[PDB]
Amino acid sequence: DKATIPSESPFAAAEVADGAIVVDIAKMKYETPELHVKVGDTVTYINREAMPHNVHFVAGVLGEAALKGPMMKKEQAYSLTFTEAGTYDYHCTPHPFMRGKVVVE
Ligand SMILES: [Cu+2]
Ligand code: NA
């Protein structure tokens, strides 16, 4: 796959790793809707608002299967470690008007 998943569970915002590239979620938006990272970087999404959100990549984007990330409650987080250059678009499953992308380069 073009990304690996360190934790299938969401985890606490305080548990975010040094060196992770953070995208905050608040006001029903991904706060960095276009993020540029390098191969091998870990991107960590952190939900900063009461409304639960996830990240969802359709099939073929990160690998053969869709990746429907777990729902993050407020102050929960979720990571992906990207292993291949490319453009990876995602959305929020319950809120598909929320869109972003990670460009790995
Ligand atoms: Cu959402
Ligand atoms: Na992004």
Side-chain angles (χ1 to χ4, degrees), residues 30-84:
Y30 300 110
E31 291 202 339
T32 306
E34 176 173 338
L35 181 70
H36 291 248
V37 304
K38 62 179 73 178
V39 172
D41 285 352
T42 296
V43 174
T44 303
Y45 301 88
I46 310 179
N47 188 7
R48 301 299 192 171
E49 69 175 326
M51 174 66 80
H53 301 291
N54 73 342
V55 294
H56 182 171
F57 302 74
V58 304
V61 176
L62 302 175
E64 294 175 345
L67 175 67
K68 180 190 301 178
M71 297 306 302
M72 288 173 275
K73 303 299 192 179
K74 189 180 186 292
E75 309 309 319
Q76 296 199 302
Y78 178 70
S79 291
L80 294 172
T81 303
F82 288 86
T83 65
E84 176 173 341

Side-chain angles (χ1 to χ4, degrees), residues 15-30:
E15 290 165 349
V16 72
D18 299 350
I21 312 303
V22 168
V23 177
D24 285 320
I25 315 175
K27 307 193 294 184
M28 305 300 294
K29 299 168 207 184
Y30 300 110

Side-chain angles (χ1 to χ4, degrees), residues 52-54 92 94-95 98:
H53 301 291
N54 73 342
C92 178
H95 309 123
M98 298 177 59

